[model samples]
Target chain A: LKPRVLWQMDVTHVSEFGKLKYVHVTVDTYSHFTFATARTGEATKDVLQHLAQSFAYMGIPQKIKTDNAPAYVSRSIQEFLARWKISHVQAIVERTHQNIKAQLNKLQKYYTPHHLLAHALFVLNHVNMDNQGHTAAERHWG
Target chain B: LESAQESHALHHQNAAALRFQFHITREQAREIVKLCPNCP
Candidate 1:
């Protein structure tokens, strides 16, 4: 029920700039604070690196929800999560990607694919999530 | 303003981000963003 109780993780593709790029994304279900990075591949190593970055930025969540993707189910990933005492739950997807792409579309003209992805995530994290003037970063960080 | 251009946020979002990260009012944030060369 708390901000760090659960997080949803996924990898999506960005095809702008004439090449395909993978974006690994994690969202706190409570505050919707997101950490996203653009990667050249969706390999297990990439997923693990993204998780590490997110953990460092947002602290380790009690549980992580992800789909049954190969990267999410691989031995190394399983071991990594287990090492951190983070529970892994396999489940469905969410609309986070849709919002990410929407923001990306707005900034595509100003930046390269990777930079655009990062900026989109920055905007998403800083924008006020409710009428109370609270941002996802404020909610998650507090 | 620079942060707003880097993030490509709109006026309101720029204001919100600035207010969240710094001790700036919404009007000041908007004025700062208005002078950004990269923002329309």
Candidate 2:
């Protein structure tokens, strides 16, 4: 929220049906709108593919801040960001990722990925932030 | 019947998104298929 333009992306795990699974998540720092998907493995190629498409549709932010994971910190990502004309910021703490993960984790009690995805969409679409009378979708799109 | 069940399965798959996407109600779809079990 401090930066004029920034987004955060990270991968985190959840327990579902007594099984562990990975989810890749991204959120806009300004709007707090989010996007996420399940992944079998955390590979740079897969994450890069997601970034390419997400940036294409969502419009690239001025910069992206992320955790110090290899997938996010590699040279390949540096090349990718260079072409996009976007800056990449790295840090030991990823607050945006934590916030979004905390949200999903709260709903993980439902024990189904479908519920998680569907519920997240509803929250992002409807919930107002800080009584601002605007949802994330409204802030980002309208 | 395999044909009937398959048609039903296809009709009901992700019914929520499809309902909004196609602008059709489940009841309407069901009504049409009810006449012949596959009309809609």
Candidate 3:
């Protein structure tokens, strides 16, 4: 019943010219509003830190969906979510994460580091999906 | 659903408590204790 009811989060690694980086991807399932942050590692503490910073700016959604990575399933992360009074749900680990990887891989090929967020925004807001021929963002916000 | 304003108040109070309980530096705690002598 909320506009930004749920958020989906995953981490994807990209390599080009032997330079590798990980991007923390967060999606507003309801509005399709997307956010991304580049990071050097996927350790639990680092992931939680990034999420804390993200929530501070994004206004902390009610619930978050994840791909069941170790970081997402760790006790510390669960405790952190509890502290915030946010609910955590896991997706089908294999399929959910791979879908995000596929999208990010395609984006990395076409975009430079500085343009990453812009492209993610473009895909989320512009690409048409099923269910009434509406884009994710359109379905979400409109 | 919780009333939005009530939730906001709880969130703000939670952050203040978390900061005071976990992350407050010595000087900050000292200043707070000075401002209110009963804050231990």
Candidate 4:
């Protein structure tokens, strides 16, 4: 029903880690692509800035899905989405949160010590070659 | 039956080990629960 009906956004906590590193992840619904960013302070500002940047980089999709978190539902993000005519969707806790678990577990392993966006391009653009239908070698064909 | 596969972080050893050890497929995972926010 839309040209680019897609969804985005995920959240992670760093309080369990050193100095409380809150994180936000924005993902593409159609391609299974993800963008990860973290902030040491300000959830609302940080989240919106991150989402806005992702939208700029990926261009706006017809629909963007997020959680009920205040960051996503905030007036600023809603205003931005409205201005762009982007449909803002808030997915349920259990549903939208499915991706957060694995992402946080990764944070536990690695600490960047900075509020920078983790470019998920490498992982999203195909790290796992789907050889589900071909000779294993062809699947691994580089 | 699914439009997209569930994604987890790569460093998710807990999930990965379980995936390998118990051979727990997504559907087979006993504890995963779904919710509705945007009405499906």
TM-score of each: 0.74, 0.60, 0.52, 0.53
- Better DockQ candidate (2, 3): 2
C-alpha-based local distance difference test score of model 3: 0.57
Docking class of 1: incorrect
Off by over 4 Å in 2: A1-4, A17-20, A90-115, A127-129, B1-40
Worst 10 residues of 1 chain A by lDDT: A90-99
Q: Native contacts recovered by candidate 4, as a share?
A: 0.07
* Candidate No. with top TM-score: 1
Residues A4-27, candidate 2, lDDT per residue (tens digit)? 278878877655523326667777
**What does candidate 3's lDDT look like per residue over A1-142, in tens digits?**
5655788888766563124366677767655555666666777976887797667545588888887689999999999999989999834323434544444444433456636544544544455244344555555556
Quote the true-contact fraction of every model: 0.25, 0.00, 0.00, 0.07
- What is the iRMSD of the candidate numbered 4? 8.7
Q: Model 3: how far is A56 from its true place, Å?
A: 3.3
Candidate 2's error at B9, in angstroms? Answer: 26
What's the best-to-worst order under DockQ? 1, 4, 2, 3
Any residue pairs clashing in model 4, and if so which? Answer: A7-A65, A102-B9
Cα lDDT of model 1 by residue, A3-26, tens digit = 899999998877774443688889
- The candidate maximizing DockQ is 1
Tell me the deviation in Å of residue A8 in model 1: 0.5
Candidate 4 lDDT, tens digit per residue, A21-66? 6656665554444555556654678877877777665557788777
lDDT for each candidate structure: 0.74, 0.59, 0.57, 0.49
